[PDB]
């Protein structure tokens, strides 16, 4: 289920009330996260669970949840690179209902998109190194894209 802030705490625990806030009522067993818990570490743990409890049937969950897991590990270690948060956002948009074979992956990407929506500063604080995907090959001049 999506994370909610303390401003959403004054809200009845009904299906339509939580749904209109941008979440799901779910099993109505709420979990409270205090201030000293890092949001990136919490979502990293959640995505590790969701990416190892995938059944492996369909490509977006099977091959896109581990990519989000690796990105969140990099953001944990301060080894994130520019474009990682954009990759997480695109993964959240492309693992929604109907894109994947079952509803495991929408429920997987709900905490990620909610924590990006409400706690974006920590994910941006995870990015501390320039984007490098290649290595220089001696003899070949690279294509310096702008």
Query: Shortest Cβ distance from residue 144 to another protein (Å)?
Result: 13
Query: Shortest Cβ distance from residue 106 to ligand SF4 (Å)?
Result: 8
> How far apart, in whole angstroms, are the C-alpha atoms of residue 25 and residue 2?
9
The residue to which tokens 């969140």 are assigned = 72
Site string for another protein, 126-145 (x = CB under 8 A): ------------xxxx----
> How far apart, in whole angstroms, are the C-alpha atoms of residue 19 and residue 24?
5
Query: Shortest Cβ distance from residue 140 to another protein (Å)?
Result: 7
Residue 68 interacts with which of ligand SF4, another protein, none, CB < 5 to 8 Å by class: none
Comparison of 31 and 140: residue with beta carbon closer to another protein: 140
Residue 57 interacts with which of ligand SF4, another protein, none, CB < 5 to 8 Å by class: ligand SF4
Neighbouring residues of 21: CB distance < 8 A, sequence distance ≥ 6: 4, 8, 11
DSSP 49: H
Comparison of 132 and 138: residue with beta carbon closer to another protein: 138
> How far apart, in whole angstroms, are the C-alpha atoms of residue 64 and residue 92?
10
| Length of the chain in terms of residues written | 146
Q: What is the contact surface with ligand SF4 in residues (CB under 6 A)?
A: 54-58, 61-62, 100-102, 104-105
């Amino acid at each position: 289920t999506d994370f909610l802030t303390e401003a959403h705490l004054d809200l009845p625990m009904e299906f339509e009330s939580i749904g209109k806030a941008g979440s799901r009522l779910g099993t109505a067993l709420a979990m409270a996260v205090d201030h000293e818990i890092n949001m990136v570490s919490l979502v990293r743990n959640l995505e590790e669970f969701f990416a190892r409890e995938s059944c492996g049937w369909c490509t977006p969950c099977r091959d896109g949840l581990p990519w989000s897991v690796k990105i969140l590990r990099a953001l944990e270690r301060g080894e994130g690179q520019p474009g990682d948060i954009e990759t997480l956002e695109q993964l959240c948009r492309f693992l929604g209902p109907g894109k994947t074979f079952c509803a495991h992956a929408p429920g997987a990407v709900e905490p990620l998109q909610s924590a990006i929506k409400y706690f974006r500063e920590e994910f941006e604080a995870g990015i501390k190194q320039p984007f490098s995907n290649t290595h220089l090959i001696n003899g070949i001049q690279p294509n310096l894209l702008k």
